[PDB]
Every structure is written in C-alpha cells, then in structure tokens.
Design a protein around this ligand. Structure first.
Ligand SMILES: Cc1oc(S(=O)(=O)NC[C@H]2O[C@H](O)[C@H](NC(=O)c3cccc(Br)c3)[C@@H](O)[C@@H]2O)cc1C(=O)O
Ligand SMILES: Cc1oc(S(=O)(=O)NC[C@H]2O[C@H](O)[C@H](NC(=O)c3cccc(Br)c3)[C@@H](O)[C@@H]2O)cc1C(=O)O
Length: 880
C-alpha cells in the first residue's frame, strides 16, 4: 500500500507507451535537425559524422594497434584478426600512467614511448600497423584521421611524436567514439549490428546512416556511421515536460548545468543521486522517516547507483534497503524500506524506458532507409548500467520491442570494449580497399585500350574482305550479303508505297507517302495485326492469305480500298537473297510452323497469294533487311548517308560497296548495299582473346551457342546477362551482396536493357538504382547500388567501344575503296539501346572519331522502321 502511495507521488516518472512514442517522434526531429545543414549549428543532437563507412563483414584480417585514452591511465592494444570462419579476435593490452607533469609535445612523446615499449615487449616493432583511437567524448573530426580536443589535432601530434622517435612507423589511423567502437566490435560477430549503444555512467548511441541524409559530408552515395551524442537531447528544452524537479535539482548541482540533460535522466552517474533527492523531499514532507533527516542523506552522492542495483537485485531487497538507509544514518521502518525499494524501481525503469524511446526512433529510421516492411537488426550494447543493473536489460528489451512491432531486434553485449572497435575500423578499411581492387581486377578485363580497339578494327577489316570474295564467303563468318539495293535517293521520289513488315507474330502494314523537292518529307500510317496461333502452325498458303487481307483491311482503313500500289517487304528470318525481288526462306524462326515455305521464294509465296483475292493485284518491288531500310530512311534526309546501323535487341550494319569488290554478283560497274550480318563477327574465333569468362557464359546458355558472338558483346539482352554473370561472380567471391546468391539473382533475363539505361543515368544518392534492384527482387543496400551501377557502366561502355571499333572499319573500308583521305559520311542509326541508353551514343561517336581520324562521321537517328525503309527502298526502286 506504500507502493501505490509512491506510484501516485512519482506518477510523472512512470511513462506510458504513448509518452514514449511521442518522445520517440521528438527524437526523430532532433536527429533530422543535427543532420541537416542549416539546422545543425543550433541542433542539440549533434549527429556527428564518424567517417566509418561500413560495418564488418566477418572476413576482416590483419594485425592492428589501438590506444584508448581516458586520462590518468590509458591502454595500448594489439589486435590480431584472422579469417578462419570463427570470428575469434586475439588481444593483448597494457596500461600506462600519465603523471600531472605530463605541455602537449611532452604528453605524446610519453604516449609514443609507451607504444614503443609495448611493441618491443610484444615482438612487433618492425611491423607497420594501423592505429585506432577511442575516446569517451566527441571531438571536432573532419576525417577518419583527425580530431581536435575541445586544442590541436591529436593524430598529427601522435604522428609527429612517432617521427621524432624514428623507432617504428605507423600505418593508417582511425579515431572513433566509444559507441562506434562498440558497434564495430559487435558487428564483427553479428553482421546485422547497425547500432552501438552505451548506457554507462554516461550514455550515447550511434548508428549507420545513409549519406543522402548527411548534409555535413559531401556526397550522397553509401552510408556513414553517425555519433548522435544523444546525452545532449533536451539541452534546448525539448524534454522539459518529461523532466521533474528532481531532474532540475541535479542539473543545477552539476559540474555542467544545462548540458547533457537526457543523459542526466537515464545514466548511472546521476541515477542514485536522483533517488536521494526523492527521499530528502518525501522526508521533508513527512511521508517517510517520520520527517527525520540525517547529515548523510543531505550530502550529494551518498546514495549510489550501486545501491539501486543491490536493492532491486536481491530476493529480499527490503532488507538490503534497510541496510543502505541505516548506513545513511536513518532509522527506517518496514514501510520506509518498501517505499525506498520502489523509488529505486521507478527511477531505473524510467531510465530503461527513455532508452527504448530513442532507440525506437533509430530503429524506425534504419527501417525507412532500407524500405522493407520488416527489419532484422542487432544493437551492440555496453555500459555499467545495462550490464550490472539486475533488471534493466530485460526492461529495455521488452519496451523497445513493443514500441517497434515492425522489427526483430537482437541485443548483443560487447565485452572486450572499445579497444578492438577502433582497431576493427582500420580492419574494415583495409577490407574495403582489398575488395575494391579485387572487383576492379575483374572489370579491367572489360576495359579495352585504344591499341586494343584498333586491333579489333583490323579484324573487322579482314573479315569484311573475307566475306566479299567468292573463295571464303562460304567460310567467312561475316557473310557480306548482297542486298541488290544499288541506288540511293535524290530529291526526286514521289508517290505512295505500302510496306509489309513481318517478323514475329505481329506484322505491321504501313502506307508511306513521299513529297519530293526541297523540304517535303515522309509521313507514316501503320496498323498492327496479329497472326493467330492456328494460322502460324498451319499451312503456308493460309499464312499469306491472312497477311493479304490485313493489307486489304488497312488499305481500306486508309480510305484507299481498291487502289493498286507498289510494295516493299521486310521479312526478318534466315534468307538466301538472290535478287532485289527474290528471296528464299531457309529456316523458319520466331515460332512459325507454316508448311510449304522453307525452300520457296517468299515473294512468289506473297505474289501468288495476291493473285487470289479477286480485287487485289498489288506490285511487290523489293525484299529488304531492316538495316538496309534504316540506311535508306535517312538517305531521304541526308544524301551523304552510305551506311545503316542497328543497335538494339540485336545489332547489324550495312554500307554501300563498290560492285568490283562484291564477287558474288556478275559485273563490276556501280555500287551495291552490303548487309554485313556483323553480329556473326567473332564466330570463327577471331575475338576469342577479348572474350571474358562472362562472355563465354552468356554464349553457352543462349539459343545459338557459338553463333552471333559480336552481337552478344555489343547489344541485346546479352548485356544484362554479362552484368548478371559478373554480379554473381562478385557475390561468390564475397565482393557483393554479402556473399549470398538469391535464387532470384540466378533467374536469367532479369537485367533488361531498359534497366541498364536507368541504372547508368542515375546519380547522387542512387535511389533509382536501389529502386530497380528492389523491383527485380534483389538486395538494395547503398553499397550494393554503387557496385551494380559500376558493373553496368563498364559493360555498356565496352559494348559502345566495340561497336565503335567495328563501325570504324566500315568508314575506312568505304574510303580505301575510293582511295580517299578526308571523308564526310553519315550513318543512319536505329535501335532501342542506342536511342535510350544515356552514354552509348556519345561513347561510340568518340570511339569512331578516335580510331578513324581521317573520316568525319555524322550519326542521324532514323527509327520509324526498319519496316518503313521497306517502302522507301521501293520509292528508289520505282526510280527506273
Ligand atoms: C563503457 C562506458 O563508457 C562510458 S562513457 O560515459 O565514458 N561513454 C558514453 C558516452 O558518454 C558521454 O555521453 C559522452 N559525451 C560527452 O561527454 C559529451 C561532452 C560534451 C558534449 C557532448 Br554533446 C557530449 C559520449 O560521447 C560517450 O559516448 C561509461 C561506461 C560504463 O561502463 O559506465
Ligand atoms: C530497330 C531494331 O531492330 C532490331 S533487329 O534485332 O530486328 N535487327 C538487328 C539484326 O538482328 C539480327 O542481327 C539479324 N540477323 C540474324 O538474326 C541472322 C541473319 C542471318 C543468319 C543468322 Br545466324 C542470323 C539482322 O538481320 C538484324 O539486322 C532490334 C531493334 C531495337 O530497336 O531493339
């Protein structure tokens, strides 16, 4: 019944979950104030960047030194870290004294000397090792190696002191707060640990934070640990409705009035004192001890945090309260001991609840940063309150987990403390460096020197000459097909042309209208039709009847029903083409089972189907390959365009060639367009020394192994498969995705050209790269985004440079034909990669300018077809 009296008396010290979530939201605002640039200088929670960029992944290894300086004593540690799988650290340490005599230079001279004794005593003085520092307060820190004590940089001092000895030398330095060392130690055993926590004589906490939220450090990429210094929460008044008169009293009787106010609520230094003030006051009000007081009860610090831990710890704590009160000089009754015991619980429970509230906000922010619904997270924990107070860890654990239902949160107590932590920072720093040059060693295989592309250019040369002559054209991989397109535009052409573009299950039927003369141009009308799955699995004669009405329908839908026209034809399928108007289907592709086609002339197939529709009677002028149509299409814009190019789900190219050089066609006078089928470049082995294991792996798993090898380096779904195979390799090697391969990352096809283009065009915080990686079902961590964006940029650059080297041959092979030097030529280009990719165009233009300096090459975009150039080759065929 004295419990309820205390409860009602101390009511403002018993915090409802409501109050705690409100306090949690308040802390969230303070975190944003300290992180933001304009609000940081007056923010009470400083949110200091630690410059620690990553937690441990468990494979850290090496030997490391550290110093922990508290004053009047300090330790020098040697930390041996092995990657054997056990994550078992090896330590030795030694304590040295700093007498009152030990001027700055004298002090660090003494420190370097001890460190020198320690290294000699320890065998290691010929070794040059990293050195961590740990401090129990903040300094002013602009980089891992720096801090100003606030009067000078302590790293410069210890380094210049080492230089004056000449004994040993020291490697990279890190200076970290003791919360940070706690997090780092725990994160070496548990790699979900993103939060250091200390509830000690003092209290503070740190966490990993995303660089896009840290204004005070340049750059938006990745993460950095933030030392919150949350002891100062409420220094500006934010907590003053939670804080009581006892809280106020402690603050005025403190060495630092008005500072560290949240600490003064929750930590062990003031915790017992805060209980004394309640006893003094209740007694002065005659609610305890019959009003009597003792000289010791009114002396500060005489009731100790240790006494709280005792009183709640023993099964009889009323007896242990009787004894503490007696030592204070009082004569307690049973009630007085009941009330004392309970006051101890209320105070210690408030400390545990206030930690929960602010831990809740940190957990919530890490959760919104990662952006999933559920969060596995571990809190590295240290300090004398949470370790040696009997019930408080339980109370903290239970309250945190209530306040964050969305989180599975482990607690792990750090034993060995802050010595290894600073050491572990330098160990993780070495690991980041090793993994960087590791994955850069793989990427170097995909970065080609200007001398290497010239060699690739050369081999495109020989393979072109080889395909044109009649001797090797059977053996040549680049087949150099004659198109029988012998002429290019004038301003002359005028009329209406139909284009039938058929490959895959949906053809388009298009009407092309040409306005001659300067200005003028072309407009399009298409319509898309589907070939039903029956029609495609049936006979070929019912296939082209279905085709022919879709022409009849659209001609009518143009309003033109009943008019005869000339017609160009895009038939995308393996073909032997013997004449402009004649082509033989070799193999069906794309899913067409239609009988009576392979081995037949596709135009007679189409023409005999036009005879049968009783009205129809249209004229079939030409059969074309889609690159040829691309070249022709911007020939109407630019008369100087001799070359087509498509970079897309596939890649191909064509130029106008001297008929002297085409030996598969009788007669040497004039020029003829050559459809290279240059995706087949490299299928004889000529690129085999540029093909990585990743190229080889894409090749073996496609529909057409050993075939179209150059197309698979420069374009298609193949780029994202190259990317994926690299990413899998990095992950097997521990270099990405923390060494664990999703079944979803083993899914072939997931990296799609549209995604390689957005990934590469994203900057700053890479939110769009992470978004895509979430979309595809992959780990999205900031660190992972950078790497993935890098792999994409490398792969897409090689594709553009390789495309440049080969397109460089073509413009010289046009030039050596004519014996010329400086040429202005223009290339019509189509295809989705080149239009939509951010850097692909520019890189290839640069590549062509670099490896063909004598040629001056413009690239004009064409598009529209492909299938539309089919009617424009007809306009120039209806020429004669
Ligand atoms: C293991 C252990 O560590 C300690 S501790 O008290 O030495 N370190 C905890 C935190 O204490 C303070 O809050 C520090 N801030 C300041 O002093 C500070 C000073 C000025 C301005 C500002 Br703003 C902050 C924090 O930086 C520090 O992390 C006790 C124990 C134990 O076992 O009892
Ligand atoms: C506008 C655009 O066009 C395309 S595309 O894929 O239709 N054209 C590129 C090339 O594809 C392959 O390389 C073709 N060769 C063969 O398959 C081939 C031909 C003969 C034998 C063997 Br064995 C293979 C070439 O004829 C064709 O030029 C994609 C896009 C886009 O924007 O994504």
């Amino acid at each position: 019944d004295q419990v309820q009296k205390v409860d009602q008396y101390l009511y403002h010290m018993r915090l409802s979950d409501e109050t705690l979530l409100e306090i949690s939201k308040r802390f969230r605002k303070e975190m944003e104030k300290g992180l933001g640039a304009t609000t940081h200088p007056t923010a009470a929670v400083k949110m200091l960047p630690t410059f620690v960029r990553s937690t441990p992944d468990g494979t850290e290894h090496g030997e490391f030194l550290a110093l922990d300086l508290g004053g009047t004593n300090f330790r020098v540690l040697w930390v041996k870290v092995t990657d054997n799988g056990l994550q078992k650290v090896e330590m030795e340490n030694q304590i040295y004294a700093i007498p009152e005599d030990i001027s700055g230079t004298q002090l660090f001279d003494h420190i370097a000397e001890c460190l020198a004794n320690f290294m000699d005593k320890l065998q290691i003085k010929d070794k040059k090792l990293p050195l961590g520092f740990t401090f129990s307060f903040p300094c002013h820190q602009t980089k891992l190696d720096e801090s100003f004590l606030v009067g000078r940089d302590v790293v410069a001092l210890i380094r210049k002191a080492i230089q004056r000895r000449g004994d040993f030398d020291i490697d990279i330095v890190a200076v970290v707060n003791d919360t940070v060392g706690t997090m780092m130690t725990c994160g070496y055993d548990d790699h979900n640990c993103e939060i250091g926590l200390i509830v000690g004589t003092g209290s503070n906490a740190c966490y990993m934070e995303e660089m896009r939220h840290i204004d005070m450090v340049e750059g938006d990429e990745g993460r950095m640990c933030i030392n919150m210094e949350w002891g100062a929460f409420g220094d500006d008044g934010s907590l003053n409705d939670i804080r009581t008169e006892f809280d106020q009293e402690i603050d005025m009787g403190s060495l630092n009035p008005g500072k560290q106010l949240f600490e003064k609520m929750i930590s062990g230094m003031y915790m017992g004192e805060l209980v004394r003030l309640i006893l003094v006051k209740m007694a002065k009000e005659e609610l305890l001890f019959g009003g009597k007081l003792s000289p010791e009860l009114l002396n500060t610090g005489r009731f100790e945090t240790k006494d709280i831990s005792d009183i709640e710890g023993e099964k009889d704590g009323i007896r242990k309260a009787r004894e503490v009160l007696m030592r204070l000089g009082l004569d307690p009754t049973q009630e007085d001991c009941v009330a004392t015991h309970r006051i101890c619980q209320i105070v210690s429970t408030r400390s545990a609840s206030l930690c929960a509230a602010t831990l809740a906000a940190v957990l919530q922010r890490i959760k919104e940063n990662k952006g999933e619904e559920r969060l596995r997270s571990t809190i590295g924990v240290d300090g004398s309150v949470y370790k040696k107070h009997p019930h408080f860890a339980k109370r903290l654990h239970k309250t945190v987990r209530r306040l964050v239902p969305g989180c599975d949160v482990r607690f792990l107590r750090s034993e060995d403390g802050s010595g290894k932590g600073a050491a572990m920072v330098t160990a993780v720093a070495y690991r980041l460096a090793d993994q960087h040059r590791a994955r850069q060693k793989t990427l170097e295989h995909l970065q080609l020197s200007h001398d290497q592309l010239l060699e690739v250019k050369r081999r495109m040369k020989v393979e072109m000459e080889r395909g044109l002559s009649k001797e090797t054209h059977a053996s040549a991989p680049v087949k150099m097909l004659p198109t029988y397109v012998c002429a290019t535009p004038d301003g002359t052409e005028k009329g209406d042309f139909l284009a039938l573009d058929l490959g895959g299950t949906n053809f388009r039927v298009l009407l092309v209208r040409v306005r001659n003369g300067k200005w003028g141009g072309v407009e399009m009308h298409n319509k898309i039709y589907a070939i039903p799955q029956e029609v495609m699995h049936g006979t070929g004669d019912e296939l082209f009847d279905h085709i022919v009405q879709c022409i009849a329908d659209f001609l009518e839908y143009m309003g033109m029903k009943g008019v005869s026209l000339p017609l160009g034809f895009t038939f995308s399928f393996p073909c032997q083409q013997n004449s402009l108007d004649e082509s033989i289907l070799l193999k069906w592709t794309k899913g067409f089972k239609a009988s009576g086609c392979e081995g037949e002339d596709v135009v007679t197939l189409l023409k005999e189907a036009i005879h049968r529709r009783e009205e129809f009677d249209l004229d079939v002028v030409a059969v074309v390959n889609d690159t040829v149509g691309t070249m022709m299409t911007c020939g109407f814009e630019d008369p100087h365009c001799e070359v087509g190019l498509i970079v897309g789900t596939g890649s191909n190219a064509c130029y106008m060639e001297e008929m002297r050089n085409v030996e598969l066609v009788e007669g040497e006078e004039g020029r003829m367009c050559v459809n290279m089928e240059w995706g087949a470049f490299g299928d004889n082995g000529c690129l085999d020394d540029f093909r990585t294991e990743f190229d080889v792996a894409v090749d073996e798993l496609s529909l057409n192994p050993g075939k179209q090898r150059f197309e698979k380096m420069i374009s298609g779904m193949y780029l994202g498969e190259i990317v994926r195979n690299i990413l899998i390799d990095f992950t097997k090697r521990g270099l990405l995705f923390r060494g664990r391969i999703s079944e979803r990352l083993k899914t072939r096809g997931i990296f799609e050209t549209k995604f390689l283009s957005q990934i590469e065009s994203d900057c700053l915080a890479l939110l769009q790269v992470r978004a895509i990686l979430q979309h595809l079902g992959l780990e999205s961590t900031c660190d992972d985004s950078i790497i993935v964006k890098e792999v994409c940029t490398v792969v897409a650059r090689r594709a553009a440079q390789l495309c440049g080297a080969g397109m460089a041959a073509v413009v010289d092979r046009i030039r050596e034909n004519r014996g010329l030097d400086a040429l202005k030529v223009t290339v019509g280009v189509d295809g989705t990669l080149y239009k939509l990719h951010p850097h692909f165009a520019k890189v290839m233009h640069e590549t062509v300018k670099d490896l063909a300096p004598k040629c001056d090459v413009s690239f004009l975009q064409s598009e529209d077809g492909s299938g539309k150039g089919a009617a424009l080759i007809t306009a120039v065929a209806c020429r004669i």
